[PDB]
Amino acid sequence: ADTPSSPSIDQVEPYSSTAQVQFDEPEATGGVPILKYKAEWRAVGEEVWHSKWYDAKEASMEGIVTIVGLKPETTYAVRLAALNGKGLGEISAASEFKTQPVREPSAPKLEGQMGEDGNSIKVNLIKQDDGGSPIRHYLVRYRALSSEWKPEIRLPSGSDHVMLKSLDWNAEYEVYVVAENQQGKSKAAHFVFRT
Amino acid sequence: QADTPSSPSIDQVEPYSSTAQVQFDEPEATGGVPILKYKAEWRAVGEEVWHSKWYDAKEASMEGIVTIVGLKPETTYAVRLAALNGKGLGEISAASEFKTQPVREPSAPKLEGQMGEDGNSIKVNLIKQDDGGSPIRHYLVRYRALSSEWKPEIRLPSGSDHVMLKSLDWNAEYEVYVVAENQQGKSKAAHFVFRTA
């Protein structure tokens, strides 16, 4: 039983302040299952590594790990390692990538939560890459699948959620949320649920 | 003083086994009043009757695509779109040819959660997505509270269309991954996060 060999980076898909890393697991687990992945990254030139741990089962199902806290139009070096019952294995070779220039924000992530009533719902906003400049506000569109769209809801950048009230009981609804900054509007995140 | 819309234009078609994603641009001229719906029409090579389906405009606009369903695997089709507004249906787009993929693993399932009134439970309805051209035999469900270890995989019996998560931790965030599996294999995982009260 030994620590895993090094995983290898397939490709990196960077945005403005974050990057998506696709990788292949180590060819030798070492005897015991891979528990976590550790990513190290820093701007080319810097001498201090930034790091983040990622759950292995999650990385396998998602198919990637996302690095955050980067700056626009900047060249970065990233590397990975795997942790098993024995410890951290060999670090991979570093892969270099350049983040996108300042642009429209990425789609935000939506997380449902029980609202004030059964015919209600709290849609939490899991903030995503803002594109390099502060998001100015969130645009929200929603409707019951059976009827017409409700007027658009505008939320300030500070908002951590959006509340949809007075909904029909046990009916299906769909929600779209757009994050907009100075550069433009992001793609729409869509969320479907049943009250 | 308004007029029906001009014709939409199909950029490209990304097909699967029994469905296809149609990427298109909205009509250049709306005509004067907001486009309300899009009408998609498709006909398999050889067949003579055009199948059709209405799609909500706003919905389609936000995703950039309309999804045609009920197609046969390994089959060549022709598809076209038209827009409807206050004045009526506009010009039909040119027809676009595409061929569905052969039978394979299912595409990631669609997840529709129904928050539990008890504040610590949830019903995840499995909305029908492309099955790859072969019936889904089992839905595999992996879930955990972001603060904890994964719970054992829950394999649902063929036929089931939902999974119920109860007795959940309070004030906790949960991630759920659902895999559709048929004769040819497992789909990539569909997922979503939710929070207990």
Residue numbers in the entry:
A (entry chain B): 497 to 691
B (entry chain A): 496 to 692
Task: Show me the paper's own sentences about this structure.
The neural cell adhesion molecule (NCAM) is the prototype and founding member of the immunoglobulin (Ig) superfamily cell adhesion molecules (CAMs). NCAM is present on the cell surface of neurons, astrocytes and oligodendrocytes, where it mediates homophilic and heterophilic cell adhesion. NCAM is involved in neuronal migration, axon growth and guidance, as well as in synaptic plasticity associated with learning and memory. We conclude that the NCAM–FGFR1 interaction at the cell surface may be transient or stabilised by avidity effects resulting from receptor clustering and that conformational changes within NCAM may have a profound role in FGFR1 activation.
We do not think that the dimer observed in our crystals is physiologically relevant, as dimer interface residues are only poorly conserved and NCAM dimers were never observed in electron microscopy studies. In agreement with our earlier prediction, the FRM and FGL loops are indeed located in close proximity on the same face of the wild-type NCAM molecule. Intriguingly, the corresponding loop regions are in close proximity in the acutely bent conformation observed in crystals of the wild-type protein, suggesting that they are part of a larger FGFR1 binding site extending over the domain junction. Thus, a similar bend in the FN3 linker(s) may be a general feature of other animal CAMs containing FN3 domains in their membrane-proximal region.
